[PDB]
């Protein structure tokens, strides 16, 4: 029988106890070892409802990453509640590891294996598992990095597409590698490189999926963000403990085989996890370099007025629940009783 149930999950990971890297440290304390051979059972002749936008699993992960960041990081200056505290702020090793979320006894995780599952509604190819796949808690706007990819063609999802207020989550099937670098020896000047040819073709195939959703006669266009905090206006992410803010105008203007985005490292940032402000030490001299798989996007549609035949889409993000959602959309917890 079972039924949708909220319960405290526990986590599993391949974290290393000798590693002082803060994700490894957190997981070492909070998680258990992963199963070598994880079992997966198919449920023949079974239909089950899913709702990625109303999934308690997302909330539990949200809580973990907030505490992870709140525990791990050490800004030189922090403002919270009109109060200012200052502390030692050494640089730290920062690199997310995959985390698995598992159901306790008396509960179980259902997994939707249906082709082209749009995020809500019937799933006919359902299976049960002990734990989710390994999920890297990547904090980022406006692209989803190091995530999972659909084997088939691109898939776009929304709680409701005719609702302009609701975010659109794009799941790619072919990833686009992006290398960000702060040149060795302005210490805040950085830049990201990715394939032009690969990004244009990506944008095109996204527009095709958007056309399926809004109509063939609709002409699709991509514009930069309408405004907001620096974090959501730019493509913001972490790389080697440093906080990057990359100008993504070249990624989201659409109607040189490499695309170079001008980036800036910022010491003074807004905290995504709480009200206030944090200040970190300036970046290390030497080499700061990362290489991430662009695996998804967060988009927002203008709407705003009577349809002009044209639909404008802009990069989104800001609510990290959507980041977790892009990985947990296929899972739901049930009380197996």
């Amino acid at each position: 029988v079972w039924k949708e149930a909220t319960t405290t999950l526990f986590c599993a990971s391949d974290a290393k106890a000798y590693d002082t890297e803060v994700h490894n440290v957190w997981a070492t304390h909070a998680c258990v070892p992963t199963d070598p051979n994880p079992q997966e059972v198919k449920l023949e002749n079974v239909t089950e409802n899913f709702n990625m936008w109303k999934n308690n699993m997302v909330e539990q992960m949200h809580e973990d990453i907030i505490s992870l960041w709140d525990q791990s990081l050490k800004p030189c200056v922090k403002l919270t509640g009109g109060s200012v505290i200052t502390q030692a702020c050494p640089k730290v090793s920062f690199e997310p590891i995959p985390i698995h979320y598992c159901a306790p006894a008396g509960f179980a995780i259902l997994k939707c294996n249906d082709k082209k599952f749009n995020g809500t509604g019937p799933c006919t190819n359902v299976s049960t598992v002990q734990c989710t796949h390994g999920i890297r808690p990547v904090v980022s706007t406006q692209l989803l990095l190091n995530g999972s990819l659909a084997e088939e063609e691109i898939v776009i999802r929304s709680e409701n597409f005719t609702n302009n207020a609701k975010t659109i989550i794009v799941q790619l099937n072919e990833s686009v590698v992006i290398n960000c670098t702060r040149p060795n020896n302005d210490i805040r000047q950085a830049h990201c490189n990715l394939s032009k040819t690969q990004w244009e073709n990506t944008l095109e195939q996204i527009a095709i999926k958007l056309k399926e959703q809004f109509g063939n006669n609709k002409t699709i266009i991509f514009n930069p963000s309408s405004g907001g905090d620096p974090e959501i206006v730019t493509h913001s992410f972490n790389c080697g403990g440093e906080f990057f803010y990359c100008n993504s105008t070249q990624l989201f203007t659409w109607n040189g085989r490499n695309i170079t985005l001008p980036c800036r490292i910022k010491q003074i940032i807004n905290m995504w996890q709480e009200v206030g402000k944090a200040m970190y030490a300036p970046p290390i001299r030497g080499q700061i370099r990362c290489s991430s798989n662009i695996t998804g996007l967060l988009l927002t549609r203008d709407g705003g007025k009577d349809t002009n035949g044209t639909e404008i889409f802009r990069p989104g993000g800001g609510d990290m629940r959507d980041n977790w959602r892009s990985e947990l959309y296929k899972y739901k917890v049930v009380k197996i009783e």
Partner: antibody
Amino acid sequence: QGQLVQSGGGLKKPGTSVTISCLASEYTFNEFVIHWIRQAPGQGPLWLGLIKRSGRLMTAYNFQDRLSLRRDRSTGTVFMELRGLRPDDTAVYYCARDGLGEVAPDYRYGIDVWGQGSTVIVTS
Amino acid sequence: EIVLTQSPATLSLSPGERATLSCRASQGLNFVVWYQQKRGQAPRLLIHAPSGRAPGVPDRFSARGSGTEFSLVISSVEPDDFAIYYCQEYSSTPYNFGPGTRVDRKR
């Protein structure tokens, strides 16, 4: 709980701009959308814009050239700037929160908490 | 965007009588929310989206509907209920309010 405390407004001359602030609880600022809504004398409420918890700004098409929204994550305050003021901008201006179907575990829409309102009077 | 219309303009009632306010939508909606407003005060949410009544709201208030037609029912009107009532739609921005239905005391 669950408070929205506004400040700003007053007598403005036509052509000028006005700024209204709205201090929210940390919980509200973190979890809820905050609308900007006005109500002129003898009229019903009119939606001007909102700020999602993600930070996304959305304004009414008829105000987008004169209206600007922003938030200060340092204190948990949101703002609206209305430029090129006209006599018919005279109204009580409200900030008001709304889950917009995004707050767990109920996921409800409905503007449940309103600020005290900021009176703006545009005239010469 | 949508267009909302309410009826009647005014509902005259004696205390104890059943009130039913109507809200009509130009196109199909999933739901609408209802607000109460007295003079000098800000709007007060009555009914949250699907579904039920806001905190502090008494049991006599109820609402239902789908698509074009929605309604707010007050089973037994009390003196505190005489006010203006608005419906509101969430299909997309800009979020429209209804013109309002005035509930006054019958004589």
